[PDB]
Amino acid sequence: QCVNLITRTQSYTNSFTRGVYYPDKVFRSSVLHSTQDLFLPFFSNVTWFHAIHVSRFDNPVLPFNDGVYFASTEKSNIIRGWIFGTTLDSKTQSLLIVNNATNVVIKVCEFQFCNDPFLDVYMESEFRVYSSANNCTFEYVSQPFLMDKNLREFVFKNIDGYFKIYSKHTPINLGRDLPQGFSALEPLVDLPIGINITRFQTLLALHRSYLSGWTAGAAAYYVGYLQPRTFLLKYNENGTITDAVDCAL
Numbered sequence: 001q002c003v004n005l006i007t008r009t010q011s012y013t014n015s016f017t018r019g020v021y022y023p024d025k026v027f028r029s030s031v032l033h034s035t036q037d038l039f040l041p042f043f044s045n046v047t048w049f050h051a052i053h054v055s056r057f058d059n060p061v062l063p064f065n066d067g068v069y070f071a072s073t074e075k076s077n078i079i080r081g082w083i084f085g086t087t088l089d090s091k092t093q094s095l096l097i098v099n100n101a102t103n104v105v106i107k108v109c110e111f112q113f114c115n116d117p118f119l120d121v122y123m124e125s126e127f128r129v130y131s132s133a134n135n136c137t138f139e140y141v142s143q144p145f146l147m148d149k150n151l152r153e154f155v156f157k158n159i160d161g162y163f164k165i166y167s168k169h170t171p172i173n174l175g176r177d178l179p180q181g182f183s184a185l186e187p188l189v190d191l192p193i194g195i196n197i198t199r200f201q202t203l204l205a206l207h208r209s210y211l212s213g214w215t216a217g218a219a220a221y222y223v224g225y226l227q228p229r230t231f232l233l234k235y236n237e238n239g240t241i242t243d244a245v246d247c248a249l
């Protein structure tokens, strides 16, 4: 039941100083700590995607590289998770992250993914996301991380068997979607996945119209790519990363 419904246009914007995360689970207070890790570089070129379904395949699969910075200004219900893998078919393993109103399901199986995968609400059905899922080796259900104008930031890394997800929710006063300043991303989950990830894709939710089988919709999200970079992070009195300098400039 794979159907091509999403067309996507893309523009390019500046990351400013977004994308800093806590590199470890160690409390540091009132110090300057220099760490070398996969960070999103300051003032880097970040791709802004507008995905439109109006009521052919024009929604290609993005590369993953060394890790992905994801951002969205959209509401919590439109973007509902992500797809990670290499071939995205039944011959290789894949990771599916699906959020809904009550919880989040993170599940690694052998999914036969559709060319334009989307979660459709009517209750929610995943029959348009994939046609089959066999030999499934990981499942993890927990409290959701897309909850409620509001900028939502995620960092995905795939390092030595662990899929690390970092997140942050920042209330941005109505204006430019990518704001100035710092908002460090707290460690959200470390998943013992152990799979090869070279490509990734965003999952959107589409509503049936009941009036053009699906309601017309748009979703805007920012994707940037992490690079091995040395950062100097400032930890303040309460342990929060309030500032950083990227050592290339």
Ligand SMILES: *[C@@H]1O[C@H](CO)[C@@H](O[C@@H]2O[C@H](CO)[C@@H](O)[C@H](O)[C@H]2NC(C)=O)[C@H](O)[C@H]1NC(C)=O
Residues within 6 Å of the ligand: 100, 101, 102, 103, 105, 123, 124, 141
């Ligand atoms: C949101 O996702 C959760 C996780 O899958 C759903 O809860 C499960 O629903 C199935 C019914 O197909 C039950 O068999 C499971 O026992 C439920 N698990 C848990 C942990 O509750 C939930 O139904 C989904 N909600 C919506 C609106 O789609």
Ligand SMILES: *[C@@H]1O[C@H](CO)[C@@H](O)[C@H](O)[C@H]1NC(C)=O
Residues within 6 Å of the ligand: 012, 013, 014, 045
């Ligand atoms: C971002 O990349 C595009 C294409 O690679 C390029 O045209 C544009 O100038 C870049 N923007 C910046 C700020 O480097």
Ligand SMILES: *[C@@H]1O[C@H](CO)[C@@H](O)[C@H](O)[C@H]1NC(C)=O
Residues within 6 Å of the ligand: 134, 135
């Ligand atoms: C994968 O699934 C197929 C059929 O679903 C089965 O024949 C095969 O043995 C499975 N392989 C593993 C490693 O589970």
Ligand SMILES: *[C@@H]1O[C@H](CO)[C@@H](O)[C@H](O)[C@H]1NC(C)=O
Residues within 6 Å of the ligand: 086, 087, 196, 197, 198
């Ligand atoms: C990961 O997948 C890519 C693309 O299919 C492949 O070139 C690479 O060798 C794979 N790496 C491992 C460790 O399987």
Ligand SMILES: *[C@@H]1O[C@H](CO)[C@@H](O)[C@H](O)[C@H]1NC(C)=O
Residues within 6 Å of the ligand: 236, 237, 238
């Ligand atoms: C840290 O926590 C204290 C405790 O009340 C608070 O007064 C202060 O505003 C917080 N922030 C900083 C930057 O010290």
